[PDB]
Amino acid sequence: EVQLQQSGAELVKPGASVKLSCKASGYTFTSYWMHWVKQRPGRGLEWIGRIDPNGGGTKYNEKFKSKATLTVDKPSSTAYMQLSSLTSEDSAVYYCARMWYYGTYYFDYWGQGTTLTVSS
Amino acid sequence: QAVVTQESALTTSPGETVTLTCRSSTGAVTTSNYANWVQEKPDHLFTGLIGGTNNRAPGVPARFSGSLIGNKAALTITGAQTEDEAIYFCALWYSNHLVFGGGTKLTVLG
């Protein structure tokens, strides 16, 4: 069974950084892109970027180039997203979602999301 | 960047065939955008439905289908069920970057 297991909710002060995780199981990790998505009420879904776990090549929404850092660790089948220089605009639910490298273009499995709140 | 727009809300009745659409500020949505659709059910449970305009993900009910209708991408639900009440997001590719529409809340009354 495919699972994407995300990390626990975070509550941090403005200016801090956080690292969220998404552990994949039940499939060949390196055969699927990992996408990261920001959900804030009133703003639908916002794409952050994607990473190719075979080599860690990234593509970002230019809005997040100076905010997010995507990495993977292949041996532990885990994708990470660091968010830097945090502000209240960063408060949101964040998701990881896989997409096959080999020419299907649907999402299928999503993580359950991690809440980030940036306050005081 | 491109702005991808969806109906904010649609109401249907059980058993109806309903179509949700996805437009782009750039002009026509084409197969080169590889439109995809995702469903968010209550408790933030996301499932992929459609990719590459018209390809249904394995295990998705066959009543969901994707197409282009005019200059928009479209998700058709053929025989709406109670459990299809959800938010549906579309997303379009431009230069290897994904842009989500704002989502459509589908209410199924009954």
PDB file of C-alpha atoms in Angstrom:
ATOM      1  CA  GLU A   1       0.000   0.000   0.000  1.00  0.00           C
ATOM      2  CA  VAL A   2       1.334   3.431  -0.953  1.00  0.00           C
ATOM      3  CA  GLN A   3       1.730   5.801   2.002  1.00  0.00           C
ATOM      4  CA  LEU A   4       3.043   9.356   2.298  1.00  0.00           C
ATOM      5  CA  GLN A   5       3.536  10.065   6.032  1.00  0.00           C
ATOM      6  CA  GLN A   6       3.971  13.724   6.935  1.00  0.00           C
ATOM      7  CA  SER A   7       5.428  15.267  10.053  1.00  0.00           C
ATOM      8  CA  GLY A   8       3.723  16.936  13.008  1.00  0.00           C
ATOM      9  CA  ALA A   9       2.214  20.373  13.306  1.00  0.00           C
ATOM     10  CA  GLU A  10       4.599  23.285  13.909  1.00  0.00           C
ATOM     11  CA  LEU A  11       4.140  26.569  15.738  1.00  0.00           C
ATOM     12  CA  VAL A  12       7.097  28.933  15.408  1.00  0.00           C
ATOM     13  CA  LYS A  13       8.047  32.586  15.792  1.00  0.00           C
ATOM     14  CA  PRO A  14       8.532  34.968  12.829  1.00  0.00           C
ATOM     15  CA  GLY A  15      12.125  34.755  11.549  1.00  0.00           C
ATOM     16  CA  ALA A  16      12.558  31.073  12.374  1.00  0.00           C
ATOM     17  CA  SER A  17      12.922  28.183   9.941  1.00  0.00           C
ATOM     18  CA  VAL A  18      11.200  24.779   9.920  1.00  0.00           C
ATOM     19  CA  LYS A  19      11.804  21.472   8.150  1.00  0.00           C
ATOM     20  CA  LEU A  20       8.807  19.357   7.222  1.00  0.00           C
ATOM     21  CA  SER A  21       9.053  15.732   6.161  1.00  0.00           C
ATOM     22  CA  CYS A  22       7.195  13.267   3.988  1.00  0.00           C
ATOM     23  CA  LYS A  23       8.197   9.606   4.277  1.00  0.00           C
ATOM     24  CA  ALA A  24       7.201   7.481   1.317  1.00  0.00           C
ATOM     25  CA  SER A  25       6.532   3.765   1.483  1.00  0.00           C
ATOM     26  CA  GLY A  26       5.016   1.062  -0.693  1.00  0.00           C
ATOM     27  CA  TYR A  27       6.628   2.058  -3.990  1.00  0.00           C
ATOM     28  CA  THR A  28       9.893   2.843  -5.773  1.00  0.00           C
ATOM     29  CA  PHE A  29      10.769   6.241  -4.290  1.00  0.00           C
ATOM     30  CA  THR A  30      13.072   7.294  -7.124  1.00  0.00           C
ATOM     31  CA  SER A  31      10.450   6.656  -9.826  1.00  0.00           C
ATOM     32  CA  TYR A  32       8.062   9.424  -8.711  1.00  0.00           C
ATOM     33  CA  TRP A  33       8.392  13.186  -8.488  1.00  0.00           C
ATOM     34  CA  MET A  34       7.465  14.649  -5.106  1.00  0.00           C
ATOM     35  CA  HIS A  35       5.412  17.803  -5.232  1.00  0.00           C
ATOM     36  CA  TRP A  36       4.790  20.204  -2.352  1.00  0.00           C
ATOM     37  CA  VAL A  37       1.649  22.320  -2.069  1.00  0.00           C
ATOM     38  CA  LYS A  38       0.490  25.138   0.246  1.00  0.00           C
ATOM     39  CA  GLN A  39      -3.116  25.348   1.380  1.00  0.00           C
ATOM     40  CA  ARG A  40      -4.352  28.561   2.999  1.00  0.00           C
ATOM     41  CA  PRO A  41      -8.069  29.368   3.358  1.00  0.00           C
ATOM     42  CA  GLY A  42      -9.237  31.656   0.583  1.00  0.00           C
ATOM     43  CA  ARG A  43      -6.155  30.848  -1.525  1.00  0.00           C
ATOM     44  CA  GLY A  44      -7.068  27.311  -2.672  1.00  0.00           C
ATOM     45  CA  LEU A  45      -3.928  25.332  -3.386  1.00  0.00           C
ATOM     46  CA  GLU A  46      -0.603  26.973  -4.259  1.00  0.00           C
ATOM     47  CA  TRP A  47       2.187  24.934  -5.887  1.00  0.00           C
ATOM     48  CA  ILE A  48       5.548  25.302  -4.145  1.00  0.00           C
ATOM     49  CA  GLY A  49       7.597  23.078  -6.421  1.00  0.00           C
ATOM     50  CA  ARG A  50       8.629  19.543  -7.169  1.00  0.00           C
ATOM     51  CA  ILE A  51      11.741  17.427  -6.712  1.00  0.00           C
ATOM     52  CA  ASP A  52      13.047  14.437  -8.641  1.00  0.00           C
ATOM     53  CA  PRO A  53      14.173  12.038  -5.912  1.00  0.00           C
ATOM     54  CA  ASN A  54      16.718  10.509  -8.330  1.00  0.00           C
ATOM     55  CA  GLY A  55      19.314  13.287  -8.043  1.00  0.00           C
ATOM     56  CA  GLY A  56      17.273  15.838  -6.154  1.00  0.00           C
ATOM     57  CA  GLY A  57      16.717  18.220  -9.060  1.00  0.00           C
ATOM     58  CA  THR A  58      14.156  20.876  -8.180  1.00  0.00           C
ATOM     59  CA  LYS A  59      11.748  23.228  -9.877  1.00  0.00           C
ATOM     60  CA  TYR A  60      10.033  25.993  -7.870  1.00  0.00           C
ATOM     61  CA  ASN A  61       7.164  28.380  -8.232  1.00  0.00           C
ATOM     62  CA  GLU A  62       9.300  31.546  -8.503  1.00  0.00           C
ATOM     63  CA  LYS A  63       7.337  32.991  -5.557  1.00  0.00           C
ATOM     64  CA  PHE A  64       8.934  30.311  -3.326  1.00  0.00           C
ATOM     65  CA  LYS A  65      12.472  30.261  -4.748  1.00  0.00           C
ATOM     66  CA  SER A  66      13.844  32.288  -1.838  1.00  0.00           C
ATOM     67  CA  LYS A  67      11.573  30.618   0.751  1.00  0.00           C
ATOM     68  CA  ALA A  68      11.512  26.826   0.270  1.00  0.00           C
ATOM     69  CA  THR A  69      14.283  24.242   0.028  1.00  0.00           C
ATOM     70  CA  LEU A  70      13.329  20.776  -1.187  1.00  0.00           C
ATOM     71  CA  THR A  71      15.568  17.785  -0.588  1.00  0.00           C
ATOM     72  CA  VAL A  72      15.329  14.039  -0.385  1.00  0.00           C
ATOM     73  CA  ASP A  73      17.152  11.298   1.376  1.00  0.00           C
ATOM     74  CA  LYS A  74      16.985   8.240  -0.856  1.00  0.00           C
ATOM     75  CA  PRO A  75      18.043   5.570   1.675  1.00  0.00           C
ATOM     76  CA  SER A  76      15.229   6.554   4.068  1.00  0.00           C
ATOM     77  CA  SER A  77      12.700   7.172   1.269  1.00  0.00           C
ATOM     78  CA  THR A  78      11.971  10.648   2.712  1.00  0.00           C
ATOM     79  CA  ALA A  79      11.306  14.005   1.125  1.00  0.00           C
ATOM     80  CA  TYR A  80      11.894  17.245   3.031  1.00  0.00           C
ATOM     81  CA  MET A  81      10.801  20.844   2.679  1.00  0.00           C
ATOM     82  CA  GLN A  82      12.511  23.606   4.649  1.00  0.00           C
ATOM     83  CA  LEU A  83      10.828  26.981   4.906  1.00  0.00           C
ATOM     84  CA  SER A  84      13.103  29.910   5.823  1.00  0.00           C
ATOM     85  CA  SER A  85      12.731  33.414   7.256  1.00  0.00           C
ATOM     86  CA  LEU A  86       9.210  32.674   8.366  1.00  0.00           C
ATOM     87  CA  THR A  87       6.334  35.176   8.467  1.00  0.00           C
ATOM     88  CA  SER A  88       2.617  34.944   9.154  1.00  0.00           C
ATOM     89  CA  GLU A  89       2.081  34.658   5.387  1.00  0.00           C
ATOM     90  CA  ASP A  90       3.718  31.216   5.741  1.00  0.00           C
ATOM     91  CA  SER A  91       0.988  29.917   8.061  1.00  0.00           C
ATOM     92  CA  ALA A  92      -0.797  27.180   6.102  1.00  0.00           C
ATOM     93  CA  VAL A  93      -1.300  23.430   5.750  1.00  0.00           C
ATOM     94  CA  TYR A  94       1.485  21.942   3.612  1.00  0.00           C
ATOM     95  CA  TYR A  95       1.177  18.712   1.596  1.00  0.00           C
ATOM     96  CA  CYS A  96       3.407  16.382  -0.339  1.00  0.00           C
ATOM     97  CA  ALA A  97       2.012  14.477  -3.314  1.00  0.00           C
ATOM     98  CA  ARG A  98       3.674  12.066  -5.760  1.00  0.00           C
ATOM     99  CA  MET A  99       3.505  11.979  -9.529  1.00  0.00           C
ATOM    100  CA  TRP A 100       5.058   9.294 -11.746  1.00  0.00           C
ATOM    101  CA  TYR A 101       8.250  10.062 -13.617  1.00  0.00           C
ATOM    102  CA  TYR A 102       7.230   7.854 -16.572  1.00  0.00           C
ATOM    103  CA  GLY A 103       4.491   9.766 -18.316  1.00  0.00           C
ATOM    104  CA  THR A 104       1.334   9.728 -16.344  1.00  0.00           C
ATOM    105  CA  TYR A 105       0.414  13.155 -15.172  1.00  0.00           C
ATOM    106  CA  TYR A 106      -2.131  12.506 -12.453  1.00  0.00           C
ATOM    107  CA  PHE A 107      -1.514  12.881  -8.818  1.00  0.00           C
ATOM    108  CA  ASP A 108      -2.769   9.859  -6.965  1.00  0.00           C
ATOM    109  CA  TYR A 109      -1.505   9.626  -3.347  1.00  0.00           C
ATOM    110  CA  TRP A 110      -1.196  12.652  -1.090  1.00  0.00           C
ATOM    111  CA  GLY A 111       0.169  13.023   2.421  1.00  0.00           C
ATOM    112  CA  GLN A 112      -2.251  14.040   5.148  1.00  0.00           C
ATOM    113  CA  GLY A 113      -0.697  17.503   5.486  1.00  0.00           C
ATOM    114  CA  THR A 114       1.326  19.280   8.170  1.00  0.00           C
ATOM    115  CA  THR A 115       0.077  22.515   9.716  1.00  0.00           C
ATOM    116  CA  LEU A 116       2.505  25.389  10.117  1.00  0.00           C
ATOM    117  CA  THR A 117       1.556  28.419  12.183  1.00  0.00           C
ATOM    118  CA  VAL A 118       3.887  31.410  12.375  1.00  0.00           C
ATOM    119  CA  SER A 119       2.890  33.806  15.145  1.00  0.00           C
ATOM    120  CA  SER A 120       4.357  36.279  17.681  1.00  0.00           C
TER     121      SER A 120
ATOM    122  CA  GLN B   1       2.071  34.286 -13.677  1.00  0.00           C
ATOM    123  CA  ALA B   2      -0.929  32.579 -15.289  1.00  0.00           C
ATOM    124  CA  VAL B   3      -4.192  32.713 -13.402  1.00  0.00           C
ATOM    125  CA  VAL B   4      -6.249  29.557 -13.471  1.00  0.00           C
ATOM    126  CA  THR B   5      -9.936  30.090 -12.680  1.00  0.00           C
ATOM    127  CA  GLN B   6     -12.682  27.703 -11.623  1.00  0.00           C
ATOM    128  CA  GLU B   7     -16.320  28.204 -10.604  1.00  0.00           C
ATOM    129  CA  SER B   8     -16.271  29.016  -6.863  1.00  0.00           C
ATOM    130  CA  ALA B   9     -19.261  26.799  -6.152  1.00  0.00           C
ATOM    131  CA  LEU B  10     -21.669  24.509  -7.977  1.00  0.00           C
ATOM    132  CA  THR B  11     -24.768  22.753  -6.712  1.00  0.00           C
ATOM    133  CA  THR B  12     -26.128  19.611  -8.296  1.00  0.00           C
ATOM    134  CA  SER B  13     -28.661  16.972  -7.440  1.00  0.00           C
ATOM    135  CA  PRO B  14     -28.014  13.281  -7.051  1.00  0.00           C
ATOM    136  CA  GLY B  15     -27.757  11.394 -10.319  1.00  0.00           C
ATOM    137  CA  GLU B  16     -27.154  14.416 -12.543  1.00  0.00           C
ATOM    138  CA  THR B  17     -24.294  14.784 -14.995  1.00  0.00           C
ATOM    139  CA  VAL B  18     -22.319  17.906 -13.986  1.00  0.00           C
ATOM    140  CA  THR B  19     -19.249  19.516 -15.537  1.00  0.00           C
ATOM    141  CA  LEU B  20     -16.676  21.655 -13.690  1.00  0.00           C
ATOM    142  CA  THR B  21     -14.380  23.852 -15.752  1.00  0.00           C
ATOM    143  CA  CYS B  22     -10.906  25.305 -15.614  1.00  0.00           C
ATOM    144  CA  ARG B  23      -9.855  28.353 -17.602  1.00  0.00           C
ATOM    145  CA  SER B  24      -6.559  30.149 -18.112  1.00  0.00           C
ATOM    146  CA  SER B  25      -5.809  33.835 -18.362  1.00  0.00           C
ATOM    147  CA  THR B  26      -3.288  32.926 -21.085  1.00  0.00           C
ATOM    148  CA  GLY B  27      -5.915  31.833 -23.594  1.00  0.00           C
ATOM    149  CA  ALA B  28      -7.007  28.357 -24.580  1.00  0.00           C
ATOM    150  CA  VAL B  29      -6.232  25.417 -22.333  1.00  0.00           C
ATOM    151  CA  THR B  30      -4.790  22.753 -24.616  1.00  0.00           C
ATOM    152  CA  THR B  31      -3.492  19.218 -24.221  1.00  0.00           C
ATOM    153  CA  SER B  32      -0.004  20.777 -23.926  1.00  0.00           C
ATOM    154  CA  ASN B  33      -1.075  21.990 -20.458  1.00  0.00           C
ATOM    155  CA  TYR B  34      -1.557  18.380 -19.214  1.00  0.00           C
ATOM    156  CA  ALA B  35      -4.520  19.396 -17.063  1.00  0.00           C
ATOM    157  CA  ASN B  36      -5.010  17.489 -13.875  1.00  0.00           C
ATOM    158  CA  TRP B  37      -7.764  17.288 -11.327  1.00  0.00           C
ATOM    159  CA  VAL B  38      -7.652  16.577  -7.608  1.00  0.00           C
ATOM    160  CA  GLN B  39     -10.514  16.004  -5.147  1.00  0.00           C
ATOM    161  CA  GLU B  40     -10.409  17.244  -1.562  1.00  0.00           C
ATOM    162  CA  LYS B  41     -12.968  15.476   0.611  1.00  0.00           C
ATOM    163  CA  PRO B  42     -13.751  16.490   4.232  1.00  0.00           C
ATOM    164  CA  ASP B  43     -10.902  16.255   6.732  1.00  0.00           C
ATOM    165  CA  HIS B  44      -8.419  17.448   4.075  1.00  0.00           C
ATOM    166  CA  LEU B  45      -8.294  14.130   2.228  1.00  0.00           C
ATOM    167  CA  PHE B  46      -6.835  14.713  -1.232  1.00  0.00           C
ATOM    168  CA  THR B  47      -7.038  12.179  -4.065  1.00  0.00           C
ATOM    169  CA  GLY B  48      -5.808  12.562  -7.650  1.00  0.00           C
ATOM    170  CA  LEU B  49      -8.560  11.923 -10.212  1.00  0.00           C
ATOM    171  CA  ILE B  50      -7.370  12.853 -13.693  1.00  0.00           C
ATOM    172  CA  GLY B  51      -4.108  13.704 -15.388  1.00  0.00           C
ATOM    173  CA  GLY B  52      -2.956  14.629 -18.878  1.00  0.00           C
ATOM    174  CA  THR B  53      -6.409  16.086 -19.647  1.00  0.00           C
ATOM    175  CA  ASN B  54      -8.293  12.784 -19.798  1.00  0.00           C
ATOM    176  CA  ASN B  55      -6.449   9.974 -18.059  1.00  0.00           C
ATOM    177  CA  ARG B  56      -8.190   8.595 -15.000  1.00  0.00           C
ATOM    178  CA  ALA B  57      -5.987   7.477 -12.110  1.00  0.00           C
ATOM    179  CA  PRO B  58      -6.268   3.783 -11.198  1.00  0.00           C
ATOM    180  CA  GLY B  59      -9.147   3.002  -8.869  1.00  0.00           C
ATOM    181  CA  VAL B  60     -10.980   6.317  -9.394  1.00  0.00           C
ATOM    182  CA  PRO B  61     -14.704   5.729 -10.093  1.00  0.00           C
ATOM    183  CA  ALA B  62     -15.404   5.590 -13.780  1.00  0.00           C
ATOM    184  CA  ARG B  63     -18.075   8.300 -13.412  1.00  0.00           C
ATOM    185  CA  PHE B  64     -15.228  10.851 -13.345  1.00  0.00           C
ATOM    186  CA  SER B  65     -13.843  11.906 -16.722  1.00  0.00           C
ATOM    187  CA  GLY B  66     -11.669  14.695 -18.046  1.00  0.00           C
ATOM    188  CA  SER B  67     -11.780  16.534 -21.332  1.00  0.00           C
ATOM    189  CA  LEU B  68     -11.355  19.870 -23.055  1.00  0.00           C
ATOM    190  CA  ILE B  69     -14.586  21.781 -23.688  1.00  0.00           C
ATOM    191  CA  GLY B  70     -13.924  24.806 -25.851  1.00  0.00           C
ATOM    192  CA  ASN B  71     -10.934  26.628 -24.427  1.00  0.00           C
ATOM    193  CA  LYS B  72     -11.301  25.128 -20.907  1.00  0.00           C
ATOM    194  CA  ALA B  73     -10.333  21.913 -19.235  1.00  0.00           C
ATOM    195  CA  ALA B  74     -13.299  20.075 -17.797  1.00  0.00           C
ATOM    196  CA  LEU B  75     -14.126  17.443 -15.235  1.00  0.00           C
ATOM    197  CA  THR B  76     -17.434  15.635 -15.807  1.00  0.00           C
ATOM    198  CA  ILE B  77     -19.131  13.667 -13.057  1.00  0.00           C
ATOM    199  CA  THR B  78     -21.642  11.355 -14.715  1.00  0.00           C
ATOM    200  CA  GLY B  79     -24.260  10.599 -12.069  1.00  0.00           C
ATOM    201  CA  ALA B  80     -23.313  12.637  -9.035  1.00  0.00           C
ATOM    202  CA  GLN B  81     -23.295  10.719  -5.729  1.00  0.00           C
ATOM    203  CA  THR B  82     -23.677  12.131  -2.205  1.00  0.00           C
ATOM    204  CA  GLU B  83     -20.038  11.352  -1.516  1.00  0.00           C
ATOM    205  CA  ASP B  84     -18.913  13.488  -4.463  1.00  0.00           C
ATOM    206  CA  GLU B  85     -19.563  16.586  -2.383  1.00  0.00           C
ATOM    207  CA  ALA B  86     -16.010  17.890  -2.237  1.00  0.00           C
ATOM    208  CA  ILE B  87     -13.713  20.624  -3.502  1.00  0.00           C
ATOM    209  CA  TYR B  88     -12.281  19.928  -6.949  1.00  0.00           C
ATOM    210  CA  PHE B  89      -9.024  21.567  -8.001  1.00  0.00           C
ATOM    211  CA  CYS B  90      -7.590  21.738 -11.435  1.00  0.00           C
ATOM    212  CA  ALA B  91      -4.003  22.460 -12.293  1.00  0.00           C
ATOM    213  CA  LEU B  92      -2.272  23.376 -15.539  1.00  0.00           C
ATOM    214  CA  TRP B  93       1.376  23.162 -16.574  1.00  0.00           C
ATOM    215  CA  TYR B  94       3.300  26.089 -18.037  1.00  0.00           C
ATOM    216  CA  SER B  95       7.053  25.766 -18.717  1.00  0.00           C
ATOM    217  CA  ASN B  96       7.383  22.838 -16.299  1.00  0.00           C
ATOM    218  CA  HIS B  97       5.581  24.713 -13.466  1.00  0.00           C
ATOM    219  CA  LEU B  98       2.212  23.828 -12.088  1.00  0.00           C
ATOM    220  CA  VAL B  99      -0.484  26.352 -11.400  1.00  0.00           C
ATOM    221  CA  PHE B 100      -3.595  25.437  -9.431  1.00  0.00           C
ATOM    222  CA  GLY B 101      -7.025  26.840 -10.018  1.00  0.00           C
ATOM    223  CA  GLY B 102      -8.906  28.187  -7.016  1.00  0.00           C
ATOM    224  CA  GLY B 103     -11.112  25.100  -6.634  1.00  0.00           C
ATOM    225  CA  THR B 104     -14.834  24.440  -6.989  1.00  0.00           C
ATOM    226  CA  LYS B 105     -16.923  23.351  -4.026  1.00  0.00           C
ATOM    227  CA  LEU B 106     -19.467  20.880  -5.339  1.00  0.00           C
ATOM    228  CA  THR B 107     -22.574  20.562  -3.173  1.00  0.00           C
ATOM    229  CA  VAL B 108     -24.792  17.546  -3.916  1.00  0.00           C
ATOM    230  CA  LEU B 109     -28.167  18.182  -2.309  1.00  0.00           C
ATOM    231  CA  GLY B 110     -29.252  14.651  -1.170  1.00  0.00           C
TER     232      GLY B 110
END
